[PDB]
Write an enzyme that holds these catalytic residues in place. Structure first.
Site, PDB file in Angstrom:
ATOM      1  N   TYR G 106       0.842  -1.194   0.000  1.00 12.36           N
ATOM      2  CA  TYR G 106       0.000   0.000   0.000  1.00 12.36           C
ATOM      3  C   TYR G 106       0.877   1.244   0.000  1.00 12.36           C
ATOM      4  CZ  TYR G 106      -4.360  -2.547   0.962  1.00 12.36           C
ATOM      5  OH  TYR G 106      -5.459  -3.372   0.915  1.00 12.36           O
ATOM      6  N   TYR G 145      -0.946 -10.216   0.429  1.00 16.93           N
ATOM      7  CA  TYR G 145       0.101  -9.684   1.282  1.00 16.93           C
ATOM      8  C   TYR G 145      -0.012 -10.209   2.695  1.00 16.93           C
ATOM      9  CZ  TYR G 145      -3.551  -6.281   2.648  1.00 16.93           C
ATOM     10  OH  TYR G 145      -4.696  -5.637   3.066  1.00 16.93           O
ATOM     11  N   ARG G 155      -3.516 -12.118   3.424  1.00  8.90           N
ATOM     12  CA  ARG G 155      -4.806 -11.708   2.879  1.00  8.90           C
ATOM     13  C   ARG G 155      -4.859 -12.110   1.412  1.00  8.90           C
ATOM     14  NH1 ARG G 155      -7.938  -8.288   4.065  1.00  8.90           N
ATOM     15  NH2 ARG G 155      -9.333  -9.998   3.431  1.00  8.90           N
ATOM     16  N   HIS G 158      -7.289  -8.468  -2.805  1.00 14.19           N
ATOM     17  CA  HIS G 158      -8.594  -7.846  -2.628  1.00 14.19           C
ATOM     18  C   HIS G 158      -8.593  -6.368  -2.920  1.00 14.19           C
ATOM     19  CE1 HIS G 158      -6.398  -7.171   1.061  1.00 14.19           C
ATOM     20  NE2 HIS G 158      -7.168  -6.117   1.265  1.00 14.19           N
ATOM     21  N   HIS G 160     -10.698  -2.977  -1.593  1.00 15.00           N
ATOM     22  CA  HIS G 160     -11.589  -2.432  -0.590  1.00 15.00           C
ATOM     23  C   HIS G 160     -12.559  -1.515  -1.306  1.00 15.00           C
ATOM     24  CE1 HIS G 160      -9.031  -3.729   2.793  1.00 15.00           C
ATOM     25  NE2 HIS G 160      -8.017  -3.442   1.998  1.00 15.00           N
TER      26      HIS G 160
HETATM   27 FE   LIG Z   1      -6.160  -4.419   2.314  1.00 15.35          FE
END
Ligand SMILES: [Fe+3]
Ligand SMILES: [Fe+3]
Ligand SMILES: [Fe+3]
Ligand SMILES: [Fe+3]
Lengths: 202, 238, 238, 202, 238, 202, 238, 202, 238
Positions: G106, G145, G155, G158, G160
């Protein structure tokens, strides 16, 4: 072998459907109440009162309470009593009541129970079996009320000693008080949180 | 036969105290585990209620409160047997019931549901089972009604019942429903019960052969209480 | 689009005229076969009912007859769509209903059933479907009731409904029931219908998401009428 | 493709639920009845009456009857009418009624219908479509009422001629009578037995 | 216990009056539906037959008509219980039976079947059930026999039985067959009964453990009559 | 709950197997017959006779008939009778018979029954319950025999009035006749066709 | 059409607040039950976002942050429809998304994952659904990640997403995954959802026919928000 | 009928992905923020601030907060508002913000909302709808902010009175303070533990 | 909406060029693979045919060639819808059909089949789908006919159809058959199609409710053409 019928909450109207008279529903001529004392009943009269608090410390005003106890000589007015002793002929031993819709206090007018035999030749300290029913309570909660002026007996009581957390035993001991000439035992029930009252699976 | 203690209550056949699905239980459930105790006379004994005290219409909810006329609603008879877990009939046990009227409205200023009140219906009854553990009462089929768990929560039609039998350990309060009611599948209260078989144990069955022509329908509903074990060796109860 | 005749009524999807299980039909059923005819304007036309004539509470059986208070019983909303067999919505069709009250009692001196009368309930309603064939009315859930076919015969709860749409050939009267009602399985009248799928076509489904909190429950029920076929070649209707 | 909703009997109260006014149930301000004649309606007024008998010859007192007809010029007050002719603006063409709980007679106050076009350029004799609903009748029974003073037209009527049993055609022809100054057409319906009225599947 | 009326006879568990497969029924079946009536003392009462009238061999078809010797055929014992639909035993009910001999021939000049007559067999018996609704008789296993429905029609082996119990409403006459008989599957009379489960309810089961060594075989056959419902509220029977 | 044992026709020999004596089969010393009158029986003796016709109008010669009735005071010789009144000690109330293989007539020698209580404090007109068994009859046919000289009582009879087709009520009323000094009630049963006798599902 | 309140949120179709499997939830979940309220204008209203404010590349995550060149990763298009629970399209609803880059990283100094940063990828986008509730954006497929729930927790890939529609009661934030990703079966966060069918409701489906040749792949993903019920009788909302 | 798309936590980066500008991600020219006050907006400006604490009493620094409110006259800038009154044309009524990565305080610059109509002709006290999103929160938490200087109105507020535990109602009332000339309402949110803030299922 | 290219034709849903089972294909099938190209305006465009040119009987094969009387054979109506792969109706597409007569004989000196010629039947028709992609024509049901693949090869009854729609890429010619025809299972031509589901996609279904009484039967047959994808980002078509 069959399974026991599953329990369900008494619901928001349990203290109304089981005490119609006090809800202004005059269907029964003879109504059950919280007065276990009849004119010829033996033993010293006492008043048992208190409140039931939820996990927030708020008194429940929709609770239904019943108590079961022995007579002044520790004998139950029940065919199941195998003591071979005669029971007070003027004592039902059972009573039912709700809490005041405002104050939240519940109470019973009864007699102080005499000691009852315990298992294996032991002796139980005087106590009153009590059960709590109400909205949010899925299964009636069983508990016992012992008396603080019976310190000597409570110390040797089998059930109290079966509670390994000695600090919780006191939640089952009511406090004696004397309003003028009447003996009153205050017993507050805390369903959740600190000083949570001990509940039994009998 | 020298009776011993009641068989242990099977906690798995009952709803737990904490059931987040039923909101009110979140603050009215002990956080501590129930302390199991070996039984004494206090637990195996219970009060006796003489039939002399019961009125002639105590088990007839259709007439025990009718003033000007009859209550509005479905005339139904409900009967069944009360046995202990070992099949023995429970004799002279006090069975008390209470319910809402045909609108789903309870007779009390607290119930503000718009469903209409019935001036000729009380909603309270009681009886003593006979020597065969048999019981029978007549009433109006209660209507379902809304309540606030989740704003649009609805209780399926039900009749609340209570029993005081031979032992305090048998003390039980519950609710029974009527076969076919679709709200049964969505009720958070009924779903507090773990097994599907136990949930179905609370459903009164339509008893068509016992319908009374041009009069009333009938439902069969049996209740099972905990039973006592017999003692053939040491009797430590005392 | 030039419309032709209505598709043939499928006699197999309907109860026969003679159904010995339903006794009254034994003497009120023709012994001769129905004579099928090719359709004319007489069969494809039907009357029109202006909305101006309908009162504001014609589709609200809870209030259209309430005098002193509200009728006793289960508050329910019933809605659905009226389409023709080809999926087309039926617009401005007159839907009329009539039913018993919560006791299973009809408002008429003829009905001598002991079930109690409700002074605030009439049991009659009507409406016009909208441009989407949608309809909606409110009422009290009718209670089942005894009748004499076999002395102990009981009709499951039901609401009688009638429809006058675009063509006289669509004229239809029937009854719908409520999901879960156990009397549905034993009804001689409902069993006059041959297929199980058609019997189920008369059962209103609980529509939980459309329940109105703290007020009324809701049932979804769709009605299908015969449809017209379009003509692209010869138009012999005239 | 969907199947038609299955028919069911109107039941013992069909003539009450669909004619509330006449059963003393005043729920509707505007009620539907058996009077198709309005002050400005065109055509010669006539009274259509009769009885419905079961297989025993007994008149049904719980029957509900409805009729559908065209105006005096043979045009239906319906958007489905494709004649391109204007219809009597003061005529509903439909009516509903029950039988007298005592006598058993049913009736309608209407107009004598004008000839309506038949299929393939043909012409139908004047007629009134009628349907019977009642306890014991699982599906509304369709039939037609023709008039005996229209012998010439009935002879060439397509529907009447589609009935191969010429002897049954007469069960569809009502008889003209004149009570003082009013024209009355008697039409008795026999559901079962001898001279059983012809019923159509339209 | 104050008894009410008998439960309604379930017409679906019985053959209809009109059964074209069984030809003789075409002209001996009412065209009108049976009129159901609410019961009165006339329907709930029935005659009593004192045991004093019964002979010692009334229930022994092997000996009650033997003159010179024993009848020819299979020695079989048939026993069972007579209960009402609710499981209650039917006490002192008159059970009468009649059957053909081992050839399938009935003792009467009317029966012209070539199957041989047995001079030592009558084919008639009767008994009263005991306090447990138990009954027992001995006989010769009847042989199947031809009859004219369709020229080659054959009745499986059977014994005709009749019962007069506590209520006239219970009056019943029927026929029971023997397990394994293949003619059972083709009988038009037995097939007048709608359900397969009811057809099987008329089949006596081989009871091997109750065979009497070197003597007779045994069949178990239970009969169920309509039962009375108990009344706990209004008693309108009178 | 169990289902009732399914009915079956009595078959072509029912009137022989249930009346062995009259078929020359002397197996029983004490045989049941159509004579309900004993020397000490109370009430006026009457003869009940008639015929049973099929759908062709032909008398059945293989029918078995049984009747059930109360004594002269309307009390049934049955433990199920809850009238608290004593019953004629010399009356069985039940009888059985067949039809003459030739003529086709059946009959019983009995007493005229007294009125019996109906439901809800009502009173039933004097009647005799009768059941028909025979080849081609899958389930015994129940019916009642009322008497024409009891017009006043029959008019108020509950069962007769439960028959909505007043025209069929008469098929249950037998006609009184007097052969010399004996009172005879003719009662013909028509199973199918015109004037079909009313049959009950009791 | 006069709109009433939004249908009740079905708590069973959503993860509970307390999910011990997802550790961070243990201290960020109320211990008290949610208090359900009847809706008012406050709950049925919501803000409006004018299209004028949105930039031309707000829904193109491939280009809205590309500086020197294109972001590294799988070019994918994601589209679908936003409807309410009753099938009605949600018009002009603000759909906002945020995701990691192809490495699972991110764009923020907080994220210290060794997965490499992409100087030409931002990971933020937004759009307004059209009159058909349709939405479409382009991006780089995010890589899975690691995170610390249990040291080796991962995870699945995905994106969000957040929605602000017509009513505040519809406010919803969630995550959708890509069909076939094996990490989906082991994710504690995705497993907070009770039913398997609801878990699958968060999986975007490969939409092969809508792949753009020699350019980008496509995934189809539909979103369902709570819907409003229509009012035909009392309108107590106000 | 379809089921609602299941909720999922906003995750550790929700306050970054929904407020890119403040995370130094300049992708949007027009960015949404926590300032609902425009130069021409009507009403008295106020500052709403506080913190969100977990079950340990520690402020969350990764929470995303949004508020929804009516204008100064109690009208929502929403097409769903059926008051028939005109809304402040310079007011979005919605705002979004996060907490300071260090201090943990969140805030909005807005206007004090005017009273909004409640159900059944009632009137709601001025309030602001607020929702909490964050790592560990599976479903956005709904709550309301009332003002302590509106004691009179809060007392009659429908939603506040629907909370049966009067002691929890106060967790929804923010405290007014005045820093120099600006009016500030402190509102701390406690997700778990003592004085846990009331959360709604709307 | 800015349209992009047509979705790729799925070669697996079509017969291959080389199908040895169908002999004539052995020498008329390229040995080289088809070269796939990215689409241009040439592929996404197609001609337009004005309705003015079509005669009143172009879609009525029963009358468009009848001279002295009517053609001999089964009167059938065939209708259906033409949609693109995404469900969108194909408007104003030219649908042309040709078939044999009731004998299986084509109107041409080449066809020497002994099956008799019909002087009143042509076997050619055409129409334009409406705004809903709907089409309808009337004809005589073609009879099966022999052909030489293997000496005793027989084509099931069929009607050849051709379509020119919005894009040249949609150009399609095929054949549809009639439900129930047993020759369908043995046809080498129909079996050139790989999947069973695609083979069934060419079978017209009997549409009984749309039969015209005393006149013609009806078959329902839908056609699906390739569809265009919409472009929301780069539009490289030009
Ligand atoms: Fe996330
Ligand atoms: Fe309740
Ligand atoms: Fe009805
Ligand atoms: Fe026989």
């Amino acid at each position: 072998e069959l399974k026991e019928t599953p329990s369900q909450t008494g619901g928001p109207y349990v203290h109304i459907g089981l005490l119609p008279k006090q809800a202004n529903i005059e269907v029964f001529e003879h109504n059950l109440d919280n007065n276990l004392v009849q004119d010829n009943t033996q033993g010293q009269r006492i008043r048992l009162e208190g409140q039931v608090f939820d996990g927030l410390g708020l008194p429940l005003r929709d609770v239904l309470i019943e108590i079961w106890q022995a007579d002044t000589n520790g004998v139950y007015p029940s065919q199941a009593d195998t003591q071979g002793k005669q029971v007070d002929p003027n004592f039902l031993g059972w009573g039912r009541t709700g809490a005041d819709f405002g104050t939240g206090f519940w109470s019973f007018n009864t007699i102080k129970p005499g000691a009852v035999p315990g298992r294996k030749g032991s002796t139980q300290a005087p106590h009153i079996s009590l059960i709590i029913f109400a909205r949010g309570i899925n299964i009636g909660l069983h508990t016992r009320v012992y008396f603080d002026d019976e310190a000597e007996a409570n110390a040797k009581d089998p059930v109290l000693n079966s509670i390994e957390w000695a600090t919780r035993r006191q939640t089952l001991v009511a406090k004696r008080e004397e309003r003028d000439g009447e003996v009153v035992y205050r017993f507050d029930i805390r369903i959740q949180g600190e000083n949570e009252t001990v509940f039994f699976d009998i | 036969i020298i009776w011993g203690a009641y068989a242990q209550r099977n906690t798995e056949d009952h709803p737990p105290a904490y059931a987040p699905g039923y909101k009110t239980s979140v603050l009215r459930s002990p956080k501590n585990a129930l302390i199991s105790i070996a039984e004494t006379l206090s637990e195996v004994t219970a009060p006796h209620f003489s039939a002399d005290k019961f009125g002639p219409k105590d088990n007839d909810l259709i007439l025990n409160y009718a003033k000007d006329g009859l209550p509005i609603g479905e005339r139904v008879i409900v009967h069944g047997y009360v046995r202990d877990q070992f099949g023995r009939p429970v004799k002279n046990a006090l069975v008390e019931v209470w319910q809402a009227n045909a609108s789903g409205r309870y007779r009390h200023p607290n119930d503000q549901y718009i469903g209409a009140m019935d001036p000729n219906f009380g909603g309270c009854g009681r009886m003593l089972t006979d020597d065969n553990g048999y019981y029978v009462f007549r009433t109006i089929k209660p209507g379902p009604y809304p309540w606030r768990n989740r704003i649009n929560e609805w209780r399926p039609a039900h009749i609340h019942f209570s029993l005081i039998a031979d032992g305090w350990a048998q003390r039980l309060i519950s609710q029974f429903y009527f076969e076919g009611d679709t709200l049964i599948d969505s009720c958070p209260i009924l779903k507090t019960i773990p097994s599907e078989q136990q949930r179905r144990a609370l459903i009164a069955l339509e008893d068509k052969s016992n319908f009374i022509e041009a009069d009333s329908r009938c439902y069969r509903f049996d209740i099972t209480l905990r039973g006592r074990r017999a003692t053939y060796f040491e009797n430590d109860l005392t």
